[PDB]
Design a protein around this nucleic acid. Structure first.
Ligand SMILES: [Mg+2]
Ligand SMILES: [Mg+2]
Ligand SMILES: [Mg+2]
Ligand SMILES: [Mg+2]
Ligand SMILES: [Mg+2]
Ligand SMILES: [Mg+2]
Ligand SMILES: [Mg+2]
Ligand SMILES: [Mg+2]
Ligand SMILES: [Mg+2]
Ligand SMILES: [Mg+2]
Lengths: 50, 107, 31, 59, 63
RNA sequence: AGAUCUUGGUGGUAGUAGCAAAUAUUCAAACGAGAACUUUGAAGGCCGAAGUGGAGAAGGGUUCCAUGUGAACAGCAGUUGA
RNA sequence: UCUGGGUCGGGGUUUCGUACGUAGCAGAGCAGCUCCCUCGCUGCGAUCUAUUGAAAGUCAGCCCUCGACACAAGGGUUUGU
């Protein structure tokens, strides 16, 4: 490996973790939760078991 | 025991996926019979006509996604048959499929 | 006369079809 | 780690996603997916589509 | 065994079509012995043969 | 031994081409040695009155209708049938 | 096997876009009921609002379960320097 294409140091900035099972738009669970707030499924979860 | 009866729910949608329009409902009955042969081990499976009506309730191509059946491995001590036990599968009407397990049912 | 055993089996014979079909009226034997 | 954009639907568009539309009038839009883009192209009003951010804030 | 004749005769006695003839599946043997329109007539009176009602074509939606 | 000879018979091809026009079947039961195809019942469909309906003319000539058979025929099968 | 793999169920993702029912002094209005009410209530009415990013689908070739259920040490044909 002698060309400048090789022997070039890689310095990442960002790694995509959106859902690949469709048009994902949130990187993590926690980002999704903060954007949408509590949902009905989580309302009854916090209501049935308190 | 061997005269047991059990209550199952079947994802017809999963087993039907990919069948053409004019063969979806007939395939759902071949898959229901093939299902009972698996969960009961019997080759003789009698499908109740009220179950056949439910499968064909919405026509030939818009089959219900989920069905609730009841397998009943009764005794075939009625004639000279190779199979001593048969599984009569009936139809159980349900309004929701949420949180529905496979429950043993008493007689 | 009708008792509980007779009623529970009578429901079967009068139904000759699914919902929306006419009920059976009679089944009389006479020789 | 680039500029972080917001769609016609107000959703946050991470780099490498969606498309960008520069009209002849000189204004530039960014969309998250063809659903949001074709909603904008058919001149639908985001204040009347329930899953859009501008609807949630409005109501 | 075979009730092709009895379904045809019962249609003619009931003045309906073969669509509307109901031969009792329980009394297959009893119906099978009726080889004449007179025995068919008694089957209809006794209730072993029923003329089914007309399929509903409601005009309420049109009304 | 020949005549793209005459007549009859038989091969390979070959268990091959093929049994793909007009949306579609399914459950249970009966008879039966045997049921994908017969009969009944329950469904789901189609013809949609310029019909896949009910009747005739010409033509056919007994195909009509009962009961019985399961050899051959109905290019699969048949307990069914012109 | 320190079990296994299935079928359901659950969770996640994701698709579409806010379900049925109920409620509203919401609604173009209209048809009745006024000792009445001193400003009203009885019906029909597309649609609107809340309930409700709800409802529904989601592996059949998506991800994770350890929840429920039953099942899996069983079958046949062969093979020797
Ligand atoms: Mg993808
Ligand atoms: Mg010669
Ligand atoms: Mg020659
Ligand atoms: Mg071939
Ligand atoms: Mg072919
Ligand atoms: Mg039609
Ligand atoms: Mg005609
Ligand atoms: Mg004839
Ligand atoms: Mg043949
Ligand atoms: Mg699931």
């Amino acid at each position: 490996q002698t060309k400048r294409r090789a022997l070039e140091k890689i310095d990442l900035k960002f790694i995509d973790t959106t859902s690949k099972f469709g048009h994902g738009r949130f990187q993590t669970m926690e980002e999704k939760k903060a954007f949408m707030g509590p949902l009905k499924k989580d309302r009854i979860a916090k209501e049935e078991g308190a | 025991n061997e005269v047991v009866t059990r209550e199952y729910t079947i994802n017809i949608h999963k087993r039907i996926h990919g069948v053409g329009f004019k063969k979806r409902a007939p395939r759902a009955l071949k898959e229901i019979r093939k299902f009972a042969m698996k969960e009961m081990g019997t080759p003789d499976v009698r499908i109740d006509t009220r179950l056949n009506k439910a499968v064909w309730a919405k026509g030939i191509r818009n089959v219900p996604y989920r069905i609730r059946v009841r397998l009943s491995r009764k005794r075939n001590e009625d004639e000279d048959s190779p199979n001593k036990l048969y599984t009569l599968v009936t139809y159980v009407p349900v309004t929701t499929f949420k949180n529905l397990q496979t429950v043993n049912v008493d007689e | 006369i009708m008792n509980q055993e007779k009623l529970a089996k009578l429901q079967a014979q009068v139904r000759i079809g699914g919902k929306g079909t006419a009920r059976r009226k009679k089944k009389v034997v006479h020789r | 780690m680039k500029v972080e954009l917001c769609s016609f639907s107000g959703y946050k568009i991470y780099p490498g996603h969606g498309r960008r539309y520069a009209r002849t009038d000189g204004k530039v839009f960014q969309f998250l997916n063809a659903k949001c883009e074709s909603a904008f192209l058919s001149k639908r009003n985001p204040r009347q589509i329930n899953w859009t951010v501008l609807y949630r804030r409005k109501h | 065994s075979m009730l092709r004749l009895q379904k045809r005769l019962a249609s003619s006695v009931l003045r309906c079509g073969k669509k509307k003839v109901w031969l009792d599946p329980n009394e297959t043997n009893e119906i099978a012995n009726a080889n004449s329109r007179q025995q068919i007539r008694k089957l209809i009176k006794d209730g072993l043969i029923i003329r089914k009602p007309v399929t509903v074509h409601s005009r309420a939606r049109c009304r």
